[PDB]
Design a protein around this nucleic acid. Structure first.
Length: 49
DNA sequence: AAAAAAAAAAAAAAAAAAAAAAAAAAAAAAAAAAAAAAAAAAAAAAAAAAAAAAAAAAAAAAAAAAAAAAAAAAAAAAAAAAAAAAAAAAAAAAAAAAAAAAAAAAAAAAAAAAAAAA
């Protein structure tokens, strides 16, 4: 499913919150400007559940 | 031959419908822009991979915000009565293929008629 969707601008740092006690931060500018009906880019090597 | 029902006479009661003409709106059906979606090419950011590293969980231990106990008091929510909204179950139906009865064309042949020959 889709975890959550927020509307953001360039150079705004985004954080994740795993349900197995994890939190990460990657500048949003690192990742390429995606398009519709495409695949996805990995973010977090979240092992297990 | 008995019963029953239609129809027609004439003064009464009471209804219904088709078109023309112009100008505006409202349904309802089409081409045609316009953008999702999908197939098939090259192309390029991410995982891999490896070495190298140093930032946050352990551990000692005080102490300061805490969650249970006690009490008083306010009053949200739950279950029982009624009263509405909204959806499957079941039954019905109007066109619609199937069948049966009557109108128009057909010629074979003859009765009666009209006409003319010698």
């Amino acid at each position: 499913l889709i975890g959550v969707d927020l509307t953001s601008g360039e150079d705004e740092v985004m954080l994740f919150s795993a349900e197995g006690k994890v939190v990460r931060f990657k500048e949003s500018s690192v990742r390429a400007m995606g398009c519709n009906t495409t695949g996805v880019r990995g973010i977090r090597l979240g092992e297990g559940d």
